[PDB]
Design a protein around this nucleic acid. Structure first.
Ligand code: ZN
Ligand code: ZN
Ligand code: ZN
Lengths: 105, 90, 90, 90, 90, 90, 90
DNA sequence: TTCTTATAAATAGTT
DNA sequence: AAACTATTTATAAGA
DNA sequence: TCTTATAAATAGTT
DNA sequence: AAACTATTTATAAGA
DNA sequence: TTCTTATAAATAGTT
DNA sequence: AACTATTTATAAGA
């Protein structure tokens, strides 16, 4: 009965949950249905197979809010850095814009 | 209580609020005792009329929600309408 | 009850199950009443000692779960220790 | 083409499959050319009659969708209704 | 056109916007014809060089995005780099 | 210097200031020489303990910083911790 | 060095590249020392002749540049010509 | 089937 | 955006 | 499982 | 804001 | 703030 | 890279 919008957000939220668990799970005999497949994907730290792009997709959704300076979620720390970089870039383009508005007058 | 009440929304703002806090603790007490007595995992999530969140868990909330998400067997699931009829047949 | 019971894990598996079933039903009835009397949204998730799921939600479960994952402010979070403390003070 | 076709559902199954494969490729080519020519980020999602998924993204589908979900400002949105009318004006 | 153009970024801003407005309509028109002619659901999302958003969808956008997210099957997925090769190998 | 010093915070306020100004110029001089000798672009940003800003760049600062934000490949990124380890091996 | 050099571009590629790596390390070393001795935050960005990125920051690079974008008071801003002048005076 | 062609549709260049 | 064309491109059919 | 004596929660009010 | 207590409700032990 | 210079640190050209 | 002879930087005191 929920809107397709809410329902997509819920689905992404659940995938995230699943990924953050498989990232911190040391129990080799875990009984969580998705754990094994997910730990296999995570183990794609081989650098390079199951596209790492799918995984970074989820991490991105996650990274929007993972706050601990030490997330174990693949790429989280890296994505958080790129988000700051992007925010700096906007600031630089703005200032640059203003100097030229001032210059052209 | 001094008087028997009907299970119907409480109209008086002050009554509703005071009753809410009291019964909420009562529900958490019962969940606490159930978790210990019977060794189970319990998550309880409550949004009030003004949409404030209150939560109780007998273990890590996120682990309980993830086990629930992947639970892949038929199980009992009750809603308000379900419970009404269940008591109507007594 | 015909006697006071202490709040300790019931060792006897048959008795554990019998107690579970009565108290599970009692918990959902209380939750139902809370949601109606005080016009709030409640989800209750319970896994018993053999990991069977029992769930209650006043309205739809997915709806309450979405709103919960979205909540991003302070809210009371209680655990068994938290409930024990509150009980002792009295 | 050898002849002009009307824009209405192709009722002959085989003819409809042939057209679809061809135009799908053309639609993706056109998307590719626009993103290179005009330095933009494009995502195209296609579900055919038999309900199969076909997709293009200039670089990454999920990066565009992510940027889509966070965008919060009035923007051109067009449906078959909007497009028909613009085509009739001409 | 009066002259064949190469598929490489248009560097002049005025010219890039001229070609963009023109080709974006062409793209949305091809998408519409594809959806009607062949009975498919199509969603198209475009961010231009200055990150303004334009979108088309034969139906509700949110419905299409949901169907995409929940599709768990291998499927054709093209990228600018992909489409480059396919075109070069001729 | 007349005496070797260890790389640990200078505690005398006056001395620390004299040192900042002298070593800051020496840093900028080395950066200038590197930029000319090896045809590279350098931007250096320094905030002192009072949060006053000092800066040097071999070309327009804003251009170097924008070029940094636009960079998207792994690359040498040292921090105070990193450089410590490096010297300890040597 | 075995011999004094003029600060002019090194034309021999091997020598230029060896000199770059060496002096880049030396500059990072001095930046490190300045930030520890005098308790300041420093960002250092270097692009070599082939536009490859090398960087050092005492703490998080992006946080220092962010703080840089918020500065709004006149301050020391040096270029190659200012440094040449300061060198000549002495 | 894949692979032509004749044509309809798109678009570059320019107002 | 909306006119023109002149060319090029896409594509319905024919081969 | 359905009862029953007995414990616990609680409505109204102080 | 918690306290009292007359009632109503839940439930333990036992059929 | 400079200056002086004894001494430490960096580094050009060599292996 | 690894090594030095030599140049450059700079710590301490005036
Ligand atoms: Zn696990
Ligand atoms: Zn991979
Ligand atoms: Zn994380």
């Amino acid at each position: 009965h929920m809107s397709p919008g809410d329902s997509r957000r819920l689905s992404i939220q659940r995938c995230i949950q699943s990924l953050v668990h498989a990232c911190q799970c040391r129990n080799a005999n875990c009984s969580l249905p998705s754990c094994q497949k997910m730990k296999r994907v995570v183990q794609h730290t081989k650098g390079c197979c199951p596209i790492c792009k799918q995984l970074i997709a989820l991490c991105c959704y996650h990274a929007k809010h993972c706050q601990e300076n030490k997330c174990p979620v693949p790429f989280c720390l890296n994505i958080k850095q790129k988000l700051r970089q992007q925010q700096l870039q906007h600031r630089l383009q703005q200032a640059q814009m203003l100097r030229r508005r001032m210059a052209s007058m | 209580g001094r008087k028997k009440i009907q299970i119907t929304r409480i109209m008086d703002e002050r009554n509703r609020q005071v009753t809410f806090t009291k019964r909420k603790f009562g529900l958490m007490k019962k969940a606490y005792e159930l978790s210990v007595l019977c060794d189970c995992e319990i998550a309880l999530i409550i949004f009030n009329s003004s949409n404030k969140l209150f939560q109780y868990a007998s273990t890590d909330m996120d682990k309980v929600l993830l086990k629930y998400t992947e639970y892949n067997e038929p199980h009992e699931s009750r809603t308000n309408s379900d419970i009404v009829e269940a008591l109507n047949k007594k």
